[PDB]
């Protein structure tokens, strides 16, 4: 006969994954790598800039903004003024550039 | 990107001496700029190899100095023979 494989079980790992997703097992005393290693340096900026560009293009297509303001927003985003599109929207609301 | 003195030599850290670092940084700073293309006349010339330079806009390529597109002797010759 051929014996069946005694495969390793992932039940505890699954439970810990669910608990971490809820927000546990994540405190400072359970981190070993650098923060810049846990969250990438260049990948974070890539995600942010691509999201900002997508949002600006969506606004321009929807016609909520004209070409001049679109260019100015693009330049500001490239310069890095906005750390997220929530801040972008805060700036737009404050300056009354939404239509 | 905002260094008082080291400039291009900032890659060396604290090695090789003040005179060496200054000479290197000055040479690279003058070399890496954009130079006027003899053909199209625009400032779109870059160094591709020792004594060989190429324009990034019109695509021409010529021979020049090791670290500068034109040398004093070369320009003196060009003046002499117009």
């Amino acid at each position: 006969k051929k014996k069946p494989i005694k495969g390793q079980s992932r039940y505890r790992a699954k439970i810990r994954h669910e608990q971490k997703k809820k927000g546990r097992h994540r405190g400072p005393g359970s981190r070993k790598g650098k923060k810049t290693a846990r969250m990438g340096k260049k990948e974070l900026w890539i995600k942010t800039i691509r999201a900002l560009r997508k949002e600006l293009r969506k606004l321009k297509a929807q016609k909520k903004i004209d070409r001049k303001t679109y260019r100015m927003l693009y330049i500001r985003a490239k310069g890095g003024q906005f750390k997220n599109k929530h801040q972008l929207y805060l700036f737009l609301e404050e300056h009354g550039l939404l239509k | 990107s905002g260094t008082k003195k080291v400039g291009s030599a900032g890659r060396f850290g604290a090695r090789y001496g003040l005179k060496i670092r200054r000479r290197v940084a000055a040479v690279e700073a003058k070399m890496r700029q954009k130079h006027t293309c003899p053909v199209c006349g625009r400032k779109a010339v870059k160094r591709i190899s020792t004594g060989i330079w190429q324009c990034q806009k019109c695509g021409a390529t010529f021979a020049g100095g090791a670290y500068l597109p034109v040398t004093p002797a070369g320009k003196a010759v060009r003046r002499i023979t117009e």
Partner: protein, 237 residues
């Protein structure tokens, strides 16, 4: 005792031989029978970096169908037209007999004798000045500061050798030196005779100092010519 590095270099072992297979080939003029009494135009096809030349090179395709390698002068343009012959215009990149070059002009790649192929002033950033033109000889001032007389029919090219000014930038790194000298298979790093052993060098010994004056006679035999050979003077003038 043992041999010196200069003695061992004479036997042509791979440690001392030039790797003349990485290079782009020999740079010599078109045979004199083509240049004499007839001027040819050639088109520059490409400009390249020769591993060991100290100067950039260029390929020229001539009207007759001959492809040649030349030392590109400063300012040469790819696709440019150059002339070789007696009836060629005075310009950078053209090769003329020395008797047809006006005095006060800068030239390079001068033939020692008519038709040899060019021997003088071929390093990057060098030039020679045409001083006088006589029926029997043409006087040219060379980079070393010597006024040499050439046969009027010797061929030379007008302009300056590209790639001048290298020594402006320091090498900085022992690794930079390593690559530089490995590109030519030149003996590097170099030892010091004073710190060699007595068996190996005339200056060797446990006490690191020459035991004799360092100015050696010109009549010394091989294995003894080290230091200042036939030096008229030494020190800082």
């Amino acid at each position: 005792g043992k041999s010196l590095i200069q003695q061992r270099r004479g036997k042509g072992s791979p440690t001392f031989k030039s790797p003349s297979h990485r290079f782009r080939g020999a740079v010599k003029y078109i045979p004199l029978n083509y240049t004499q009494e007839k001027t040819l135009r050639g088109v520059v096809e490409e400009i390249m970096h020769d591993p060991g030349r100290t100067a950039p090179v260029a390929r020229v395709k001539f009207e007759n169908g001959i492809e040649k390698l030349i030392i590109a002068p400063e300012g040469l343009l790819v696709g440019q037209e150059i002339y070789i012959g007696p009836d060629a215009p005075i310009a950078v990149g053209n090769t003329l007999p020395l008797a047809k070059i006006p005095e006060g002009t800068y030239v390079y790649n001068i033939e020692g004798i008519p038709g040899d192929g060019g021997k003088y002033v071929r390093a990057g950033g060098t030039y020679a000045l045409v001083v006088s033109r006589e029926p029997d000889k043409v006087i040219v001032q060379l980079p070393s500061g010597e006024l040499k007389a050439f046969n009027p029919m010797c061929r030379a090219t007008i302009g300056v050798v590209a790639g001048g000014g290298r020594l402006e930038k320091p090498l900085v790194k022992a690794g930079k030196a390593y690559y530089k000298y490995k590109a030519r298979n030149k003996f590097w790093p170099t030892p010091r005779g004073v710190k060699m052993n007595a068996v190996n060098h005339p200056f060797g010994g446990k006490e690191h100092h020459p035991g004799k004056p360092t100015t050696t006679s010109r009549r010394a035999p091989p294995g003894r010519k080290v230091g200042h050979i036939a030096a008229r003077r030494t020190g800082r003038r």
